[PDB]
Amino acid sequence: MVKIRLARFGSKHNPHYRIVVTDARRKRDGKYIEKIGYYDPRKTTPDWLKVDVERARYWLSVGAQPTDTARRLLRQAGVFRQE
Amino acid sequence: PTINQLVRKGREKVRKKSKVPALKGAPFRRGVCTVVRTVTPKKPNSALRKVAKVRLTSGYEVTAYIPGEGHNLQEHSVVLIRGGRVKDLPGVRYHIVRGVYDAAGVKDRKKSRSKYGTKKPKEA
Amino acid sequence: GRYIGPVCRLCRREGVKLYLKGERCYSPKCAMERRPYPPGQHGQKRARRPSDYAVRLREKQKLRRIYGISERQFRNLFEEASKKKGVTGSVFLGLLESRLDNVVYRLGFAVSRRQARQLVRHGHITVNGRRVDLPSYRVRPGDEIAVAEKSRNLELIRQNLEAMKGRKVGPWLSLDVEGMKGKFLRLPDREDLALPVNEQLVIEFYSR
């Protein structure tokens, strides 16, 4: 399954996540196809979420299923706003 | 030589000769000893220096120098070897470690102790 | 950690008076004035002409001593300077001065660099609102350095402030005495600093 998912990139206690296009059966850290967004849960930054929306949309169109958290993030960013 | 020549032939990569067959690149090798024999130095030097002939965990049968003004070393005493060439003594490539295993520290060695494995002066 | 211990001995060794005690290091008492010779059993013996390397090393030590710094830290700073664009010399000096403790000292929030460092450690010093407790801190242009509210009413700090009421602040710094503040205006250059040291020598020593 082609998936939009997160990947741990940071450190112990300070996590950082890459919103990403990859196959299901990789490492969560694995050689992913495309970097589309990034997430800081600790909102330490004024910009904690920014995703390239168009790319994400394209991915979705192709067949990429977002993960629960990933999906939520995308929603927050506004990739589903069909208006 | 010439460029063409070089391409034909190749540059001989200088391989470094192992100074120490303590084997494997084992920084320390433990071993059981045979004899505590004292041997004479070289040509401008004269003394009687303390050498232990060691069977090693590497399976080497090498000659190792004992540092230390007063030593305790015996036959089947279990020893550790660090290496380091002794300039006067031939056959010797090895320093026995003091203050470990069965090469106990020099008594009242109280200046450059770290080399000899002798504990801090227990001051009171 | 830090040097810790007999300070003016170092000064004596180096030959140039250094202001690590702050005061007394101003009084006829830094031992430098009536005792110029280096510490030890061989102070009043003929000092043999100093070697190329040796002089450089001395210089390095002097500079390091000035800032009360671990050698490793100094090395790191040097490396950083080297990495960065421009004259490795002046930039290095700026970086050294950019240290929080040094900044505190040169704002006359303390008499001693050591004192300043101590103050920084124990939570007496505010930088732009947030109190920082690590003397290594990088102060950069347009940054404000204040005395803590818990610390404003402290005796020592008050004394220091009084001492600095009229006492000169650097052409890169601008302190508020009565609001107990201190703005950083410019990166402290070689020209700005009367440092009794030659950084070129240090650089030479280090490039090995």
Binding site: - | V36, R37, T38, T40, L48 | -
Partner: protein
């Protein structure tokens, strides 16, 4: 520190070995590699196989010594 165990036993010279070294049959017991002492070297002293000489012996190797006493 000096280990005081530097043994001072006497001996009949037995053999001319090369390079100022001498088999010296001890009066106590065995023959040992017994090189000439530095002092002796300094003051000439040609030792001959057939002299009474005193050897400085290590207890770690009592088969190796150093002639201290000429004649």
């Amino acid at each position: 520190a000096k280990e005081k165990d530097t043994i001072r036993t006497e001996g009949v010279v037995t053999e001319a070995l090369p390079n100022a070294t001498f088999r010296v049959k001890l009066d106590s017991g065995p023959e040992i590699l017994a090189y000439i002492s530095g002092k002796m070297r300094m003051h000439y002293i040609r030792i001959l196989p057939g002299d009474r000489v005193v050897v400085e012996i290590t207890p770690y190797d009592p088969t190796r010594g150093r002639i201290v006493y000429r004649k």
